[model samples]
Target chain A: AGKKVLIVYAHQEPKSFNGSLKNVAVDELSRQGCTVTVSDLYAMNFEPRATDKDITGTLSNPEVFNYGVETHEAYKQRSLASDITDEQKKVREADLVIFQFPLYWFSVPAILKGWMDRVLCQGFAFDIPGFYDSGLLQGKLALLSVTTGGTAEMYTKTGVNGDSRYFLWPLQHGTLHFCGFKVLAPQISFAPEIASEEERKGMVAAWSQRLQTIWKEEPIPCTAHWHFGQ
Target chain B: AGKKVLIVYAHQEPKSFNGSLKNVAVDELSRQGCTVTVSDLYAMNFEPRATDKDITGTLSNPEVFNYGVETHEAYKQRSLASDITDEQKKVREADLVIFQFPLYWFSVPAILKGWMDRVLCQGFAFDIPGFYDSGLLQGKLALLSVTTGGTAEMYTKTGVNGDSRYFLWPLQHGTLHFCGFKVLAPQISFAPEIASEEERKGMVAAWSQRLQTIWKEEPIPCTAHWHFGQ
Candidate 1:
């Protein structure tokens, strides 16, 4: 079997620009020869809210591996059952994980963050006495597939969006790196709402090429293992 | 009225370290003769997820404020209505908005970000059509009360945590400053969980004094208005 790749995504409406970009990413990545799985968060009704019930269930149940939950009842049912099951299975079997989403505020879409808080649980991805210890996810590779409304030039060190990498550090270093994933340099598509059709096509091709070369590239810098452990 | 100060707070457990800091801040500001209003997010059970309901509701329904079901339901039940009456009253009346929280993974906690995503919606906080239409939350002042695990030394331009100032730039520039708020220099409490009682007390006292004096003092170097109105 080929190396597994999972693309977990979020879009409030799939007909929108972000939704189109997300579809393009999935298609391009699949074309790159990886056995790819896509989780369309909106279609699956993934919940972003962590309700009292979800929290209590996670803490009390020994068998349940949930680290987070959807706040709404309908969302909870869909997230915990199908969407999560598909994503989790792919994640466990995958060599590379890719998160594709439009930048909402300065971070990931709520659904994606909820996915992390829930799916990246304590006993499974993290510790459960003998099952795993620190950095259990070591050697797994990951990359971010993002779409931004702001122009790429605006994300410069002193530009309108501050440093692009600065906005990314938390998600790259704190979340994925903390969980022991080697993160690839992100694949970014900026000014999505305004990018010309040609720019959009270029993004798709570029992203596909990057996915094809994930194993050969270095992870982004300023991380613990890259700096401290080295 | 003494300068109105609005603090939109979000902490599930009011006893957490961040929660404690929130209370202390409110108390200090109130004592300083500023008219302060605190919006306790989770206590109000503020919903962070912007579901399909919210998007469709806003676009289709005219009479509805289109706050989404979670908020609309909350408002109807008088449970978690984003403090519409008192909050808008203050935001309009206030000279400053203070955001106090423990930095979680290099950003504000999820609850706080949700507040910005929802409450600071378009047309109210910004105009999408005006030349300066994009400048958000105009005419407000901002202060960030951030606490972190690392020391000031570790957050150097090239230190372990990587430039504490870089973390603030997004909130300072993109959020508050981007919206046209005259931001004050952030008041940070470093190594908060490990600080000696005396040290922590000293830090709190210093922060209290700063909060008390901010409105009367000169604003921080990077103000938002200069960047807007182009």
Candidate 2:
């Protein structure tokens, strides 16, 4: 009941449907006595570019800049930029991470993607010998509450866009599960803009209700068999 | 043979494996009488953030921000920010577009993802009734030349990371196919940093050789069956 939850919210509008979803999470989690912190990405204008500036001190190899190597070294040395470390702290303390955003090109927005790239580096999230099931963030739970422009019918195996599960492989298995976060089934509000007011409210209400028992839910297997074959 | 080609490059190091891949593309395409233009995103320090600044005169709805609706309206009005319009102009003039980047989190780097988000707006790339096979830029061809941090073995169907094609659905199908580009099979240089120097050079040479016969190659079906099943 006193768990800390971090919502990495990535929508620009405070009045949009995405905004309402974010608000509902805040209210529901707070009512449960769970400390909810929102990293309102667009509002913070978070840096999306991964550059040499991410390392505050001297470069590991002054000749050539390698993002992976440099960032890992910086992370180990505790010399990563304040912004990255700040997010890392939030992620470190959270029992759960809910990534909330409108689907952009079937993925998270650039800003939210940057958060994953920068904050979850080699030293912090996973290392060569400690990835997937053995990743550093082993016990954390993750969820993607995504809003989509396409209707549910289109995201089928024989439909134009294929199954919705096809698009979740990368974000869920490849990234989140790779870093050892147990992935809950996504909350997909399809074609919210086309939906009626009651429909949109229903989606929001469904999300709020789900959050009430989130602690009791189990993660998906997060495997190829679960995603594709069987 | 005199087709215009645009390379959207997104690596920071000029001496890295991704840089070599980008260079070889430019040289090979130019040597073959193809007019080549490179958008070196890192060198340009391209703005990865999608914000109100993307619209010059005024947002369609200044009261509440909605990135999709506002950008779509701005594109129709020719009021999109210069940076976005500049990329769009390159894309409009190009017969082929090759995205060269080191994959971060099993997808395009945040910077390149931003290009897709801001530049390929609804009106510019796709619109209602004009997406998928009938999208705005239907005649153009697109390819993804990705460098991965993980070995090829780790990305197989039974591997810990799952199949590589599992991650391509979003970029190749959801984004490129939706925008009406015929997506060629990707060139994946896996774990280049861990490979031998000769192997690295071989990867670059192979890429250069392939470009000579690229026009003869056909686009992939880009379906769930092809990527996941048989």
Candidate 3:
């Protein structure tokens, strides 16, 4: 009853299919008595650029700037910008994080990607010898609810896009799993813009239905074998 | 004698390792008499978010917003934003495109990823059926010269980060190959921050050395088998 969920959403349009999936998450999870928070990235115009601007105090090495090293130090010193800290607090408080967005360039859009680049710093989300299963944010669940422009058939192993899992590897494994978030199986609603009205409704309903039993689902093995079937 | 090249560079500090790599590309390519243009996303404060603003003309579906569909139609109608078109012009004129950046979350940084999202719109980069070898931007070449925080050993298959190629699938194959750019073997300089001055110089010199014969290098096999191994 005290579960906290963060829906980190990135989409420009509220009426789009991606928005529908986001709404359902907020509705379903809230209805289930979960405290929900939404970071509407576009509406917030969340800064995606990672730079010295993100650090408020002196640079670790005032002579040269290295983003990874600087951010890690800023995170430890608690001198990161407020926006970054605000998001990190949400991430810290949440039991689950559902990233909702339409896939861009077969990855998360720039705004959402910025969130990952900024909020999840080395000392915060992970550190040397402390990533993957032993990441700083261990025990939190992460899922990617993505919409794509390509049809389902187009993303198969033999299809033009290769396997959909190929695209998911970077996000689900490299980013989320690297930070110790157990990645749930992705909810990929392929080509929703071209789908029939009923089909779109079916996709949305399916997501809502899944959310009802989401807590019971096991995470996919965030490994090469699961992603590429090695 | 008329080789044209574009360096789309994304990094904050000009004295940083990423900046050093970019400078050498310009110096070496210029020395080789290649016409070069640099779209320094940070210096330009380039817009990374793709919204209705990217499309200057009428919305294809004012009632429902889908970025892909709207941007596609805007591209065909010659109504894309000036910044997007400006980059597209550079891309169209370039025979080779080199993306220089530090890896963020195992992929391109937000600013650079935004360029891929906005500048390489559907009509400009590829069509639904016109992807891969048959894609629209075929005959052009693309290379990713990336820097990473992790050591080379840490990115190995048995390491905590898995095979480095696992993280490269989405960018090398899904994005670049899908847009029909023949992919060059990536220039990966692992852990420049931790490297000795000689090692960092070695990494930069190696890239400069390679660029001297870059035109002769064959495109890597941009296949899943090559990336993941069947």
Candidate 4:
């Protein structure tokens, strides 16, 4: 299948466990004849702050500042910064989008979060009357490939973190599903730093194996019950 | 009756709704003789990426990069960046920490998220054995004063967004409570851009009034039940 994939990777060091996982995705997907592009956020020194500088032209309303409204208009007019436009192009071209990052404070890294805030603006990703089931980015698939510092047991319902799904709502439901991307079950690589070398390799191998059958995989029901199950 | 308050504000424009909320927090707290300091993240041009640049001198381990590990070591060795240290100093001296920002994709703005990731390093905020109830910053109070793009009706249990509390899990429980800050109930100003001028003023006045008795309020339970009740 000649599908295109964009991995929005956020990590500083290339030799980290996150790096290995990202590499495996690229390698396995490319081997299957899929075109692959990685947005290595740190290497790009990607700007994470969403400011007025994001627009190249004059303000539409100079009196008040509303980021969502301003960015939506800037995106439509093609007045957005080149960096934002570049990422949007990758998203536009991709069949599947993978976010690869180590969890920071139970969420995506700030750099990646900035990408979500900036690149997925209105008019490009969603609009007032067209979100969730009817977003602009329909027909696309999205997945979260996350690495956490905490162990699997620690993320349980009765455990310290109180279920990993609790933390997934914002990213999976609010951001991705809100934009109409069919969200695949997240690939959670837990405690890679604490695991043995063999275990880490196993995590990478498991991901590679999943990619081989990803075309057949079904998206999770992006609903509150699926996330917070009564 | 004097207390120290640090407002870690993230808004680009000084006249934005978020800015108004932050200003009222400062004004109200200062009026009560509480020494208030505002860490305007956008104004400071806070760095959002967690990278090696965060640490000075030499890498803790030049061969591998683990942010939590390296930053933990850096905290102990006093090798963290000065900007990070400056923020830490503010947190250290504060009796209450209030986060003021616009909700981006159901989360804090990237700049504010970066503040949490960078300032609350393992050693400073928590340790392997010293997280949750036993965390380092045990006595400090933390509150999230957020402005959202969506209306209150849209964030209900049966509504489009499926309850605003669903998104609060990661920030309130996972990060703030994990760091041992007594988590206060969030002040959510919904759809400020869509609100009338009188409604917008009401939101500001409401926050100002909340600050009047903020000292007497108790922290939320910070449990799964509080966020997702059956």
Question: For residues B17-76, what per-residue lDDT tens digits would candidate 4 score against the true structure?
Answer: 888899888888988999999998998999988888899999888888778888999999
Residue-pair clashes, model 4 = 0
Scoring each candidate complex against the real one, what DockQ results? Answer: 0.21, 0.85, 0.80, 0.84
The collision pairs in model 2 are none
lDDT of candidate 3 over B142-185, digit per residue (tens): 99999998899988988867788988888988889989999999
lDDT of 3 by residue, A1-230 (tens): 77899999999989888899999999999999999999999999999988889999789988877788899999999999999999999999999999999988889999999999999998999997688899888999999999988889989998877789989988988899999999999999999878899999999999999999999999888987888884
Model 1, first chain, TM-score of 0.77
What local lDDT does model 4 show for residue A44?
A: 96
**Deviation (Å) of A115 in candidate 1:** 3.3
TM-score for chain A in each prediction: 0.77, 0.98, 0.98, 0.98
The 10-residue segment of model 1 chain B with minimum total lDDT is B221-230
Off by over 4 Å in 3: none
Error of 4 at B28 (Å): 1.0
Shift of residue B159 alpha carbon in model 4, Å: 1.0
Better of 1 and 4 by DockQ: 4
Top candidate (DockQ): 2
Colliding residue pairs in candidate 1 = A49-A71, A68-A118, B42-B45, B136-B179
